[PDB]
Design a protein around this ligand. Sequence first.
Ligand SMILES: OC[C@H]1O[C@@H](O)[C@H](O)[C@@H](O)[C@@H]1O
Ligand SMILES: OC[C@H]1O[C@@H](O)[C@H](O)[C@@H](O)[C@@H]1O
Ligand SMILES: [Mg+2]
Ligand SMILES: [Mg+2]
Lengths: 729, 732
Amino acid sequence: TDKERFIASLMARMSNAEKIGQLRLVSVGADHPKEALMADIRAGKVGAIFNTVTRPDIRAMQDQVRHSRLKIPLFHAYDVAHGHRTIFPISLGLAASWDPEVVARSARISALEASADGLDMSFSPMVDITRDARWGRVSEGFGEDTYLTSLLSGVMVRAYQGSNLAAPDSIMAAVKHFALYGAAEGGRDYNTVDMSLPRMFQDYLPPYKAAVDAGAGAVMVSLNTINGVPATANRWLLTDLLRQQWGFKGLTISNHGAVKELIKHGLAGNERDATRLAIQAGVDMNMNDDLYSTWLPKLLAAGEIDQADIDRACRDVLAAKYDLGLFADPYRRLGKPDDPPFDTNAESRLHRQAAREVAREGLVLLKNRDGLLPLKKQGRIAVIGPLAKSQRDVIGSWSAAGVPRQAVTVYQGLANAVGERATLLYAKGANVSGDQAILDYLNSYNPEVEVDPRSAEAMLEEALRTARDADLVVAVVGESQGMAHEASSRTDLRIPASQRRLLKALKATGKPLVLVLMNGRPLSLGWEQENADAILETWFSGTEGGNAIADVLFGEHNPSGKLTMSFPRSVGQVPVYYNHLNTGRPMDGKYTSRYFDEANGPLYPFGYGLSYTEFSLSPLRLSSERLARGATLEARVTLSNSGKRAGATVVQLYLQDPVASLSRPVKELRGFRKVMLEPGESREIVFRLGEADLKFYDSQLRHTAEPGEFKVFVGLDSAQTESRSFTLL
Amino acid sequence: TDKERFIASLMARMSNAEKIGQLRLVSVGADHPKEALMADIRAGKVGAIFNTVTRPDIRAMQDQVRHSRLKIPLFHAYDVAHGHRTIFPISLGLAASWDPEVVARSARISALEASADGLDMSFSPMVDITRDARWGRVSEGFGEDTYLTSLLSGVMVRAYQGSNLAAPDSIMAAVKHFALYGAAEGGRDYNTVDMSLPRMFQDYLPPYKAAVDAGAGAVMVSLNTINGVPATANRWLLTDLLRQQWGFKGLTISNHGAVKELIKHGLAGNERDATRLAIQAGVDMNMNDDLYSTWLPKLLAAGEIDQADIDRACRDVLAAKYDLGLFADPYRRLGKPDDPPFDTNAESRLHRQAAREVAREGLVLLKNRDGLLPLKKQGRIAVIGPLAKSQRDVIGSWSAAGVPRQAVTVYQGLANAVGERATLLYAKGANVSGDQAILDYLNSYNPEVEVDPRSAEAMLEEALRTARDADLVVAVVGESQGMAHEASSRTDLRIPASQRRLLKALKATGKPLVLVLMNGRPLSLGWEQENADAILETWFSGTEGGNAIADVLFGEHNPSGKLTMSFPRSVGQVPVYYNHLNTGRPMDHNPGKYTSRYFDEANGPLYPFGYGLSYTEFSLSPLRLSSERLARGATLEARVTLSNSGKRAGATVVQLYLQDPVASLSRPVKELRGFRKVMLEPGESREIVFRLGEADLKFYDSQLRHTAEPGEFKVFVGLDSAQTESRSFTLL
Ligand SMILES: OC[C@H]1O[C@@H](O)[C@H](O)[C@@H](O)[C@@H]1O
Ligand SMILES: OC[C@H]1O[C@@H](O)[C@H](O)[C@@H](O)[C@@H]1O
Ligand SMILES: [Mg+2]
Ligand SMILES: [Mg+2]
């Protein structure tokens, strides 16, 4: 009530002009020249800033607040998605570590670095469920599984916000994108999402609720329609669900120009009506389009909105600012005015140990023919491909304040790891695409992709000549980070054709071929699975990616990472995901649910990933065959390292309700342990199962466990498991 | 109440054993040997038969009924989808005619032929909305548009059932598949369907309701889940919607083994519980698995079901049998006991005139560089490809009693059309697929696909040598009918790789290249659009396909057919459909990077909805609305003048689309709301007048309120969904 008292008496001091000013979130750009923005801050007409990311620059803004009547401090936000200055792997890569503590360490250090530069808030975590590999932004999520994405959503929020949001090394988590954004039709970004309420509540919503339950201070609203209604004008989503049902008590933030876009959605004929829909639906804070400042006064004058609409939004902004401690000290994350200046991008402000150690855990070994990996640090190694010496790509999309020049490439990683003991030979081999239209797209806003001016044939001859000089080729191939961005939807999930032509040429030299993959989404790797001697999935592995990849290639680390998203054989099988419904005619037969013109199932399933050692599980044992209401069951299995090398695997518990009021999925992830074992080491794993893990949203959204059979699965991926059954009473 | 009285007094006479017997629908096969089935009919334990399709064979069954106590007649059903013995184009092809009377003529003659053979019912029309070209069964539907599929659903039902269901040349329409079956995830057949109730009511359901409103005597229930609940156990779908809300008064029929499959759906641990869910959800008649006969007695004994559950289903079966006139004369479609025997597949029992005249209307001219088509009947024409001399494929999937041997191939069609005036040279050029696994699948039960024992290279050399001898190549390519069947879902929408290798070789000879396409779904034709000199979409055009294709190729007919389903550039763009939502960041075909689009391919469809070329040129005058305000209960007039401004007689389809740019839901960028197909002679002009009222402006909102909101409405008019002009009015 200290906070309630403080807020109530500040808002009793405030005019509607000052209140509406608090709802305005802007960045320096064409729409808002720097100096007219500073003038707006001095006049009490700006609530917050995004995309201003250095102490001197953020100090300069907060300094303008003393000129306003009430001196209400700004908060400063940025897209700290998977690192601020020290870049960790893209979220899809982090998820692949299957280790909350690893994911937490990336968020803690992100918060530490961003706070240290003056930032109060990150538009993070992105926790949208993704079953469509075509979608540009799958790189920003944690994959396709509801349980894993929901858990890591909670982990990220608690790591960022820490023990106290006032703390100088804590930032506010603004979870995104609320809601259902990953389910765009055709995987086209911003596009229509349409689904049943049972699927919505069971599969897609839980990650947002986890962020709320973990204490997320903010929620960012999505650009997409939900069953005909844009989320930004969806009163049901933002008021009935978010506030009245989940009990969210924080700040709602519009997406970039999302209020104005209600016109193109066909929900409003003009900006006046677009504003009314958004504030009355439950959008507090308006990003960039400034429709709130332009129209909220006139809507109130004409009775089209209530004072309570303005007050709800303003109180939310002030409560956020309060919990960040900005009313106690606006400069608590900006040092002291007499502090000596520093180089923001100084080497000593980075966390390279952390980045390298996190980057190792998420690398996924997909293929290793006749123990080719790990490599010895001897002989001549050809390092070939357009992503081998790429600093821009290895830090991935949404790379915040990450500096390309400070990033360790895959080539450099190998250079450092072999020293003078092996000879590395380099050849680019191909451009990332051989299609000038795709190169035009990738280089459209910024020059993201360095184009060799030579012919494909010239580059291939040079690559072939390098392979011939070498004992083995390490091909570094896949996507440029510009291919797994916002709006970068693909019709083709394969490696680009220029690089596939390179890989076939390289295969034909007869040299052992190791594939180091870079990608922000599941790829189509039919050919690579038949032909490559080994494949390593490195996603975009960040600032210290090259070192972490070199550590795994030379056996300093044993690949432990496993997929959190199913890899389709082709884009034609989209969507494919492990927790699908059985249907009345499950494919194992001509008259089953399947394609005829391709092998069925995914190439690599959910939970899949190889190691340099071999693991075994003892028989699955349940503590009983009946479970009483309010009692707790124990699934017990013994994991061994039955190979020669130390290493980690992930023991995954799945669950099936084979008889239910709805057709339930064939299995759903409900627990896991990542376990490091020395050779011969054994760990008894014990899973606790209760009524909470058996529940689902029925036809009428009743969240219920029904009595009857439950099947418990345990294995090292969703494909290779054993089941044992019990009964709920 | 004559019927109600009759039924009430029959059912008062009946035991539960006799009532449960009426719910049993079976076919002769492994599961039911012919003679044990006849014994079951005599014992009053069979309600109906499917897949028995000749008079002598159907007579033999109905003869067994006199041995039952109450002598309740059987009805006999079959899959008369697009013809019985004389096969018309696949439904997707029929839709492309944009002509109710053409679609009606195919259904009338289907009913006539099937009734003439003894059949009472067809599991038809299939009226499932299809936005996913990967799905095997898009060939059986009318495309992606709700308005067109809803209209043709009504047309098909009224054609089949005629003026009286008692009539000897009328059959009962059993509309399918209720419901949402075309929206399977991944386009994998039988697979999960999951959608909002606004999309369901606005886009997907109306065709089923049209069948009901047209007086469909029966509805067949789908195999797919709807939002977690199999349609077969979906009480909401079959009771609350179908009966209580739409007022359906006919018979519900399960799909093949659909009750038992509730176990694999994970809705039931056993057959006892699977039966209870299905009969209590509102499934009257049980197809093949016989769970109803095995379990309904014990469920009733133990109180797990009510007598009213049994009675509802039985009364429905009897009402269907009554309206077919089978209680007045079980042999009314089986002739008289004296009647002389005949050859069922006699040439004189076919309707070749009708099939040829219907097949012309749906052929779609996609490309015609420098008026190559129509061809003259002179010189040397190379006819190359694996579908050129294919009889089995041209009759398509769900070909009922259609005989391959009786079908006119594309080669034969051209042979008849040129007689002795031109030289046709033949070469197969490639096998339908070059993948032995796909050939194994296609030839798995029956040999559907003739594999040439020569090498691809040998066939290519022979094809190339034929092209060299010729003035122009007519390449006959696309899918085998086994590729657009039930469960034949594809990951690739292109022409098979063996035929694409053939087309590239042929292109490289420099000879004019005409593509005759055969397919049961939208194909990916990026390459063919850049490289072929002309493209003709022939779908599967049926028994008289070859003749109808030859008529269009030689200008006897002017291509009038237009697409009812959007053609994607690649499978990676699935789904693509004209009536999509704008989104908050629409791409402007002034491209932006941050719009709703793919980056690694051209965006939009290759060919849009309503698209199709002609041998002549048409013009439209400016669109004129009768006013700029429309009063509640009043009627607006959109008026345009269509001309033949070219040298040949021919038809086009003038299409009216509608947009509600401001609404409580984001509405589609446009929705089809009317059309005229118009034949014009050169220089001929016709003032077209569309009537628009409040009914055409309505939509299902967040809470399924079906209303027109006041405000702006935009009217579009053009010869396809791409190339239109708009004018606005206001509702008050
Ligand atoms: O710049 C901040 C925001 O910009 C928007 O364009 C994106 O949709 C958000 O996800 C992002 O966090
Ligand atoms: O063969 C009769 C019926 O069998 C079902 O399995 C099919 O799905 C229906 O379309 C068909 O009409
Ligand atoms: Mg149960
Ligand atoms: Mg309106």
